[PDB]
Amino acid sequence: MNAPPAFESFLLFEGEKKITINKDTKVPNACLFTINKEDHTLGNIIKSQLLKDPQVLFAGYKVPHPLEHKIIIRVQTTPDYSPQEAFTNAITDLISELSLLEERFRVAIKDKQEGIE
Amino acid sequence: QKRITTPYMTKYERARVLGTRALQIAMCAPVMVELEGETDPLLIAMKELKARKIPIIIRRYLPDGSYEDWGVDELIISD
Amino acid sequence: VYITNFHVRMDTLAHVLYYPQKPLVTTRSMEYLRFRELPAGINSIVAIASYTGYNQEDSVIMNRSAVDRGFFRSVFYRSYKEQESKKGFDQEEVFEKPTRETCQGMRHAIYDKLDDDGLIAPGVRVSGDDVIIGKTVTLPTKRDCSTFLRTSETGIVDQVMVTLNQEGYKFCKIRVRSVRIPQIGDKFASRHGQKGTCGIQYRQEDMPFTCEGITPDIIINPHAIPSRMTIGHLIECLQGKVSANKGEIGDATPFNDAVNVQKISNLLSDYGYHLRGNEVLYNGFTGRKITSQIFIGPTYYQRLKHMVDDKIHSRARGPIQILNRQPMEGRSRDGGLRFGEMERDCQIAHGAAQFLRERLFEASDPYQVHVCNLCGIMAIANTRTHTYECRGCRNKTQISLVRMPYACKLLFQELMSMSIAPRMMSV
Amino acid sequence: MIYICGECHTENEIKSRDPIRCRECGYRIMYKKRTKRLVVFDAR
Amino acid sequence: YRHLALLCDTMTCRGHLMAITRHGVNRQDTGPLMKCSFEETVDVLMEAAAHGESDPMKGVSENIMLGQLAPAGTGCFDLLLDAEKCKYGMEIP
Amino acid sequence: SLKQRLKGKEGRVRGNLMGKRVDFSARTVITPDPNLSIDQVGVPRSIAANMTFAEIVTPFNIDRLQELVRRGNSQYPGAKYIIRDNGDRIDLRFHPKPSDLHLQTGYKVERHMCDGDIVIFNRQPTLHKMSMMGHRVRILPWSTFRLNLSVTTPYNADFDGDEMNLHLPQSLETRAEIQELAMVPRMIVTPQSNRPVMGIVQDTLTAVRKFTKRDVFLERGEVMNLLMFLSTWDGKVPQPAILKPRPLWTGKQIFSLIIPGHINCIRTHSTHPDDEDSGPYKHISPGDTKVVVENGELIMGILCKKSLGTSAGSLVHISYLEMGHDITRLFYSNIQ
Amino acid sequence: SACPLRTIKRVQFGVLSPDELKRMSVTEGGIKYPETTEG
Amino acid sequence: MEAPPVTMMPVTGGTINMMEYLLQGSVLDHSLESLIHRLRGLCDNMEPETFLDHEMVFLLKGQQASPFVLRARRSMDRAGAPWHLRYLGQPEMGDKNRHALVRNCVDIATSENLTDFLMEMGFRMDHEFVAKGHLFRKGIMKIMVYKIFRILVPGNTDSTEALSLSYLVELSVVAPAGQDMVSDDMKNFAEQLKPLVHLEKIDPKR
Amino acid sequence: MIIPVRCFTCGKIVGNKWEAYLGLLQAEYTEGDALDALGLKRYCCRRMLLAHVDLIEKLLNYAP
Amino acid sequence: MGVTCVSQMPVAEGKSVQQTVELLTRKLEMLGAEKQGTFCVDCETYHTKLMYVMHNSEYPLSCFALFENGPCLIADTNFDVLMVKLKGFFQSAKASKIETRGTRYQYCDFLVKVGTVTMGPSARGISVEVEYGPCVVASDCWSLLLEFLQSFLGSHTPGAPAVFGNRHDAVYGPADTMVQYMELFNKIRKQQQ
Amino acid sequence: PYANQPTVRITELTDENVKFIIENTDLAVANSIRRVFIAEVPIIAIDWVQIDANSSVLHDEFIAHRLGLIPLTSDDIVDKLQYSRDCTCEEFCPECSVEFTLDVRCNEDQTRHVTSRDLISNSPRVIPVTSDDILIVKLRKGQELRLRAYAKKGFGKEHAKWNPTAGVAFEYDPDNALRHTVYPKPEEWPKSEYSELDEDESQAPYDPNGKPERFYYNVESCGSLRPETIVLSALSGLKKKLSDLQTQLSHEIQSDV
Amino acid sequence: KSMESVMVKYDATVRNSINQVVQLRYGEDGLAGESVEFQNLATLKPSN
Ligand SMILES: [Mg+2]
Ligand SMILES: [Zn+2]
Ligand SMILES: [Zn+2]
Ligand SMILES: [Zn+2]
Ligand SMILES: [Zn+2]
């Protein structure tokens, strides 16, 4: 019997920082953001946007064990671009998209619900 | 004297020594090479072996009864 | 379900299941053996595919969401009986709440659940360090001999019967109900010879999904079927799908002649699936279509009784038998594993003496005995006056200390009663 | 405390050191009654 | 072949083919504690006391019995310290 | 009787001296854990909290051990007993106020086990040396011994209610030996057949035959997600084999990244023409058999069990005899 | 305590002297009363 | 058996605890002058402090039988000095060789509104004493010589009666708890005052 | 034992359909007809009803 | 002790929590203000009555324990260690901890600090504190803080605080700033929505 | 180097399903929002059954599982009910949970089906959705079940009791135009509902340089919320996790020092 | 039990417990079987 709380998957602990930028000594302009207590919901979404940016040379997410919640994302970028800048920009760009869909859905339901017909 | 034993350390004398040196460091023994961000007695001592500097001499008793006594520095690190 | 009077029967070790279901594919002759009355498993949307890897070597992946809507939930009843004994001429094992006021040996625990009669009531939640039945024997003040549960019972007691035994004494039966949700490790097995423990469980969202939303509750590995050739599990996978969409129990009598693989398949084709069972799935974590079309379908799964909780054993500084000083067993299954000769010999081969010395001596029986040097016989060694004397040799200056296994000291002491006199000569 | 009878199913309250025989009918198998404490389960 | 020769040389070593099933090598040149390893433990020892046969205590199975580091690998060498080498010690502790 | 007590099987002669019931050990079911290195085991939390190494308190660690004792018993990163200098042991369940305990140099804390330890993992029908090999723990939430698939072949298990035992070396002298003479990384080439005992097994072979085939081409999104799973990468994407029409990398190229250092090996894939070697097209291979690995880059050919598995001359064996032990372990984990 | 630790190197087996046994016994010149205790 | 709760990551971050090594002895008033002159000679050359202070001990009567004891000290003599609040742990003395009393100690300077905060929190004032005497120091070691005075009347410091003609002398070191041999240095210093006054570790019990 | 409140796969509430399924079957509807009429179309939402052994029916025959 | 005012400014529109701070801080930088380090205010709570312990980074060693209307004790950091030691005896509460972390901007003897009371892991709200170190007198330095706030804060400028309370010649205290922070924190914890 | 522009297009609505079609978006943005429709939209459901008398033939933790998976009407009060940790209500308590009570004693001869109708709520708005009725337990003469339970608010990653939707169904590229899946033999595979191919053609021709776009959806609400709100509440929620990470990233980029 | 204690003693004479020489040099070649791999001799088979 080893059944742990299933809310811990997203619940941050007292001694747990959510994002910990660990710069890579081996490669210049490379940073490892290690969001803890997230998963592949936010890992595929963040990596998807970093990739669209042309300046981003490499970008990806590995959830190191399925039974331990963490993501590790690395954004190595051209010299002028900063990995921290690439991370800060995408969260905003996705937020615009999400805000756009939300606004657009509301536009859509009202017509259909009231019956565009 | 006449060392007849092989110059290289044996697979098993690199184990008892790495372990013995380690009980010394953990017990507060002086260290013999720089240790940086390292607090683990085996890592501190596996490092010394890399440099040939551990303070121990190995009595390889021969089958007949005579203790040839090679020293850490002379023995060639096999790893 | 074992028999339908589970509520009054009270046998040791009996496990019911929350939702037993009749199989979608049924042999015609099952009805004869009361199986649509006492089924032993649940039809699972199983999907023979390789996913994250945790499904290799007879391992099934499983849906955390479905084992949460009830799939395979079970209760593990275990009955415990204590009989009042009047064997003593004056010794009576009466039934009472032992109280620190009158019984000398009240042990360290919570004796506050036992009610007045002595029996924990139905409905409580027994835990470690709780005393379920309390009895106070009377010595010629009143040593309390009470009953303690072992470890991890932690099951709300369901019934406490108090009634006369065949011997004519007064006895009680307590059934301590415990719920058992499927976890990582529990054996589950199909009806075609394939048995497999779970390797990870994953939630509905992060699992492969059909294009109408049907996420598989079990993902058995593809590699297991070949070498063993159970090509009947895959036929019942097809027929169950045909039966589910046509709504009828599908018969699979050993020889029906109306079931070649092809005839069952053509029926499945009308409903709209690949004639041969494959369906198009999409990776759950990324969403991208898994290239190869996974074979999915409904197949009966039986949940074997064996569970990890019964198997798990662990030990460390555990209770020791005083007579031979080698580990024994108390609560918690603290009797450890055994280093028998076979595994006492790989260690010599690896050449590892110190592990062997540690596992054999330090771990099981570490003793130091003070031995006289001139004669190898053992030596009185007062600790408080710090004197060490070998009476019979009149030596107080030469008493060495030698570490020996306790198991061996007793061989040395026992041999001496027989008069052989080993000298543990140190020189 | 309050034991429950098996046949006539009367709850015959019995103090300690008493015979566990029920009145009216002689069903000598008697089951203890639910705790008056409260235990709280999570639906989980 | 290494493994093949040793089984086929240890067996044919003292000069007579030796059965090596528990019965074949049951007769052996061993200290009483080693020959107390096989069911005659009570009997061999009583004979041993009368005949005063010291057990040389030099066997892997012999030492493990008395909890002494055995003469196996990791066991055949005693280690001694260096008095001169400790000078380089970068005493820090 | 005394003669009866020291008798035969079960007597102080066998039952109590040669084989005894050792402590600091645990047994449980083994389920698959691919995301573990070949030298990791995942002890269940209860077993890890039910066993303990002993850490001599020292100036360097006195800081952490203060918290472990304060938090002892209550939480998994806690200490249970603090054996003292004269040998007494302040069991911490009953010390009334664990917070106030005073640790000193020379005193040893029984820290509950934790990631990074060494344990000798053994199967019960022990026979070959590969039966008792050492693993580094990595404590995980569920109650199962989590093992990598590659090490199952030497253990000879398959995870179907199989049960394996975990014995914890308990002193720094023994940890050194388990670490240096029997760690799964150092026992890949057995002396019985001079062959690697453990080879890429179940799914990972059916995948390697297909990742490494002539028609496989992975696009940019896939290469980066895949290369983040390599722990030997120098961080540089390679140049895609097909460039201008679109940038599509070839499977062989991204398998030449897992391959360690430089190795030269030439072998035959499981499907091999019985005549191609002699005739024309010998070195252009119409069917892509004839694996050639030159300099550490598969230059041609599909990989089979003989090329990647447990046979003499296997790609795994070339590495052990040239490149090393730890590098070979890393390469196996990355391939999986 | 003070007595030094050391390694058994040879074990010698002999029937023990009737006299040595007498001297080593803590019991005074032979167990006498059969009953373990009365007070 | 059981899932001990998992717990966080911060292990190194935090504070080491402060052990107080204490040796306590008494001097009769007639010989006080000889001891004062003697301590001045052995100790560092600093003019004597001549401190006067009022200390009230607060105990918390919670469900657990042992009441938490926090000692609050106000310096009446030194104006504009903050109240000091200290917690003293159970004796950790073990080795006979140490010949010292070891207790866990936390020292916290507090604002004047300390009495009200403690009473609202629920701590209850129990016993109050006024201590007057001289303080001298050698290295880390601090020697305090003081004459405890009983306080009568519910609240005030105007009138005090002497608890004893004699004065307690306490040698105290607030060590960081790193390494040891702190007790050895203390034993040596205590030995010098031993002919003038026998400073020994006296157990608080009876 | 009792119809499970929600299908194990999707989670549709199927628990509320047993009384009619038994009943619609009673009128004459075929197993195909009842499942479709109540609203279950996915293969999972059907297997709970097509295959449930009512058991509380027969443990209610034991007198309390 | 220099007169201080703290208020919460709503993000407004669809501006994300962080987006609004970024903009407000840039507006402060557009006052000629120069950054003078970073400030962290971490507070923990107890359900005992109710205890609050808060510590501004501006004060390096002090820990403030406030008992609602009851007195505030300004104590050394060893106070937190005493609190942890008592912990088994003490009450703990359930994840009520509240922290505001933001940049410090200095504009000619006025220090302005804008931060996001991030509750636990999720940000919600915004706290602005303007302090005047030269102004030892308080309750009538309100004209100053008000004019400066109308300069940058504009709308949502606070009409004083009650920590000034009754008109008095009483000097402003570090305790008063902590009481303002406690009221602001109670409001974020309960504003909801 | 910036955000795409995504459009939506409801194609059918019903009280229990909304088939939107989404367009001009990344495969990931879709899979991510599909996962938030399943495991992050909040709902209110039972979580503290305390049983006072159960003479039913089932145990008293099968009259828990059963109450828990009942679907209660979250309505708009999930917006105004804080989580137990957020509420700081020291576990459950009014305003941090909704109280549900039941009382059935079967004294008449016929079996008395107990059903969701008998779960009664102190808050009028949250009442079991069926308001036919899930059967909690059939009862015989003389047996009683009385229970007190409180319903805390819930995500779905914690347990499937708080899962708003049943079959969330997704699909892009109905004809395998980008040949993501290589039909072993294209002929026998039945056509997708959203097909545009002519009947004769087996599958459409390879169009290589086209990333995936045109994600279909069919959220089917179990009943706790109306199906549209499950879509909108997912999208708000994803924003919060995204908009929460930025705060921490910033409160951490500055203090890299 | 029969091959209980043959060891490669320090001068390479594989010897049993009594110190008797069972094999003069281990395996007749002195090479331990882990680093040895199969090679084609190349001169025995070819024609004169
Ligand atoms: Mg097996
Ligand atoms: Zn003698
Ligand atoms: Zn009756
Ligand atoms: Zn369904
Ligand atoms: Zn509330």
From TrEMBL, chain A:
Residues 31-103 form the DNA-directed RNA polymerase RBP11-like dimerisation domain. GO terms for cellular component: RNA polymerase II, core complex. Pfam families: RNA_pol_L_2. Keywords: DNA-directed RNA polymerase, Nucleus, Transcription. It is found in: Nucleus. It comes from Sus scrofa (Pig). Coiled coil: none annotated. InterPro entries: RBP11, RBP11-like, RBP11-like_dimer, RNA_pol_Rpb11_13-16kDa_CS, Rpo11-like. Belongs to the archaeal Rpo11/eukaryotic RPB11/RPC19 RNA polymerase subunit family. One of its GO terms (biological process) is transcription by RNA polymerase II. The gene is POLR2J. This is DNA-directed RNA polymerase II subunit RPB11-a. One of its GO terms (molecular function) is protein dimerization activity.
From TrEMBL, chain B:
One of its GO terms (molecular function) is DNA-directed RNA polymerase activity. The keyword Transcription applies. GO terms for biological process: transcription by RNA polymerase I; transcription by RNA polymerase II; tRNA transcription by RNA polymerase III. The keyword RNA-binding does not apply. GO terms for cellular component: fibrillar center; RNA polymerase I complex; RNA polymerase II, core complex; RNA polymerase III complex. Its main location: nucleus. Keywords: DNA-directed RNA polymerase, Nucleus, Transcription. It is found in: Nucleus. DNA-dependent RNA polymerase catalyzes the transcription of DNA into RNA using the four ribonucleoside triphosphates as substrates. Common component of RNA polymerases I, II, and III which synthesize ribosomal RNA precursors, mRNA precursors and many functional non-coding RNAs, and small RNAs, such as 5S rRNA and tRNAs, respectively. Pol II is the central component of the basal RNA polymerase II transcription machinery. Pols are composed of mobile elements that move relative to each other. Belongs to the archaeal Rpo6/eukaryotic RPB6 RNA polymerase subunit family. This is DNA-directed RNA polymerases I, II, and III subunit RPABC2. It comes from Sus scrofa (Pig). The chain holds residues 49 to 127 of 127 of the full protein.
Automatic annotation (TrEMBL), chain C:
Zn(2+) 1 binds at C372, C375, C390, C393, N395. Residues 335-425 form the RNA polymerase Rpb2 domain. Residues 1-333 form the DNA-directed RNA polymerase subunit 2 hybrid-binding domain. It comes from the Eukaryota. Zn(2+) 2 binds at C393. It is found in: Nucleus. RNA-dependent RNA polymerase that catalyzes the extension of a non-coding RNA (ncRNA) at the 3'-end using the four ribonucleoside triphosphates as substrates. An internal ncRNA sequence near the 3'-end serves as a template in a single-round Pol II-mediated RNA polymerization reaction. May decrease the stability of ncRNAs that repress Pol II-mediated gene transcription. Belongs to the RNA polymerase beta chain family. This is DNA-directed RNA polymerase subunit beta. It comes from Sus scrofa.
TrEMBL record, chain D:
Keywords: DNA-directed RNA polymerase, Metal-binding, Nucleus, Transcription, Zinc, Zinc-finger. GO terms for cellular component: RNA polymerase I complex; RNA polymerase II, core complex; RNA polymerase III complex. One of its GO terms (biological process) is transcription by RNA polymerase II. Zn(2+) 6 binds at Y27. Zn(2+) 1 binds at C5, C8, C22, E24, C25. Disulfide bonds join C5-C22, C5-C25, C8-C25, C22-C25. DNA-dependent RNA polymerase catalyzes the transcription of DNA into RNA using the four ribonucleoside triphosphates as substrates. Common component of RNA polymerases I, II and III which synthesize ribosomal RNA precursors, mRNA precursors and many functional non-coding RNAs, and a small RNAs, such as 5S rRNA and tRNAs, respectively. This is DNA-directed RNA polymerases I, II, and III subunit RPABC4. The chain holds residues 15 to 58 of 58 of the full protein.
